């Protein structure tokens, strides 16, 4: 639906439960402007590019760790319960090992779901059958000689990404059984990297976040790293406006009179 969706942007708060029977995700086809990680979402893309490194140096040093992921499912139940806390505004936190190459099933994808003072954990591996849906990589030479008795290899080379490669998503709101929940979320992604036995662009994995944007203060008639920026529709006399509220994520609710 779009009849309610739009009139949910403009002063749509929850007005009579803006439900339209659904199966889709209404994106924001406007000046979302793809801001580029507002400094508020700077803790998040930090804690989400570390949990893509802890799993980046653990599948690149002992490759047998890619064939026993169903017996080590006590160590991956502590990551997705950590990504689910890299911010005080979180909805989900989700890990999806990719299917084995040239295969079908998804192989062990979890999910945590903040519900206030709680975090519920589920296995959505029997639903996302066949995965229902290379980068800026700089080598970091692993070196081991420290009189360590646990490993027995001098030197090997891994691949590591950073915290300015987390990907964004145009703001959306999904529908729950068909009855749109009003939240205006946004998703942040990442990507593991095992070792292909020549190179290392093999992308097995992904870890994702869901953040709530119904508490940020959009700013139509100013200039900043916000989402809708300088979008004011002033029928200008001489262009004197005033954004006047502590509004949430409501587009076009300034006051352009300012005589």
């Amino acid at each position: 639906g779009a009849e309610a969706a739009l009139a949910y942007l403009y002063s749509g708060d929850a007005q009579q439960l803006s439900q339209v029977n659904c199966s889709e995700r209404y994106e924001a086809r406007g000046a979302g402007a793809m801001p580029g990680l507002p400094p508020s979402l700077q803790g998040a893309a930090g804690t989400l590019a570390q949990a893509a490194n802890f799993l980046n140096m653990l599948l690149q040093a002992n490759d047998i760790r890619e064939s026993s992921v169903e017996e080590d499912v006590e160590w991956y139940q502590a990551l997705v319960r950590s990504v689910a806390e890299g911010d005080p505004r979180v909805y989900r936190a989700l890990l999806t090992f990719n299917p084995p190459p040239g295969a079908s099933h998804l192989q062990l994808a979890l999910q945590a779901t903040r519900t206030g003072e709680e975090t519920i954990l589920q296995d959505l591996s029997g639903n996302w059958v066949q995965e229902e849906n290379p980068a800026l990589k700089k080598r970091v030479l692993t070196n081991d000689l420290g009189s360590l008795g646990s490993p027995k290899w001098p030197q090997a080379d891994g691949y590591v990404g950073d915290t300015q490669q987390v990907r964004l998503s145009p703001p959306f709101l999904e529908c729950q059984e068909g009855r749109l929940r009003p939240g205006w979320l946004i998703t942040l992604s990442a990507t593991f990297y095992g070792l292909k036995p020549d190179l290392s662009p093999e992308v097995r994995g992904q870890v994702q976040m869901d953040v709530d944007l119904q508490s940020v203060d959009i700013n139509q008639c100013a200039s900043g790293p916000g989402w809708y920026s300088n979008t004011h529709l002033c029928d200008l006399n001489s262009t004197q406006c005033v954004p006047l509220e502590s509004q949430g994520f409501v587009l076009g609710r300034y006051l352009c009179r300012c005589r």
Binding site: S67, P100, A103, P151, K152, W153, K196
Partner: protein, 178 residues
């Protein structure tokens, strides 16, 4: 069969085991154990005529696991070395990519094994022998003529198809007491 004592061999029949090995990929997770200096743990390879027989292998030559995948045009002789002749369990993983793979031992490190000759994708017919073969000297390989001992374990081939070593076989002996 867990707990080999002698020349105990083991063949396979299921057309699903016969297919995951043949292709542009291969995986193994044999959690074996041995007290020998040679042997054979996997010998899928068609009737060996003139040496090229598109054979794969996983030996234990004098404490040196040797992934020996072949395509006819080029042999491969990957190797690790340690105390594998005697002792306790050991975790193998002999990944392939059509022309390149590791022989990753427990923690030694991924001794990569780039060794094609010209080509790829020639894995061909034949039964999947584990732990040996009724007679191996007459076969063209003639390297794993003895050492067919050990107490084998988990064998999840192709990272999906978990396999039981007695439930899907047709031959062998001596399940217990090693």
């Amino acid at each position: 069969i867990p707990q080999f004592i002698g020349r105990s061999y083991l063949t396979y029949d299921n057309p699903d085991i016969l297919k995951r090995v043949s292709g542009s990929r291969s995986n193994v997770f044999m959690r074996f154990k041995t007290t020998a200096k040679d042997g054979l743990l996997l010998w899928r390879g068609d009737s060996p005529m003139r040496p090229n027989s598109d054979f794969i292998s996983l030996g234990l030559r004098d404490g040196a696991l040797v992934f020996s995948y072949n395509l006819g045009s080029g042999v491969a002789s990957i190797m690790v070395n340690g105390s594998f002749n005697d002792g306790r369990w050991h975790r193998v993983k002999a990944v392939r990519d059509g022309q390149s793979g590791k022989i990753t031992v427990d923690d030694y490190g991924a001794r990569t094994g780039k060794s094609p000759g010209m080509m790829r994708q020639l894995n061909i017919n034949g039964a999947l022998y584990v732990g040996g073969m009724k007679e191996i000297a007459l076969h063209t390989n003639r390297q794993y003529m003895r050492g067919l001992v050990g107490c084998i374990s988990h064998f999840t081939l192709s990272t999906d198809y978990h396999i039981s070593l007695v439930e899907d076989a047709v031959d062998g002996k001596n399940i217990n007491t090693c």
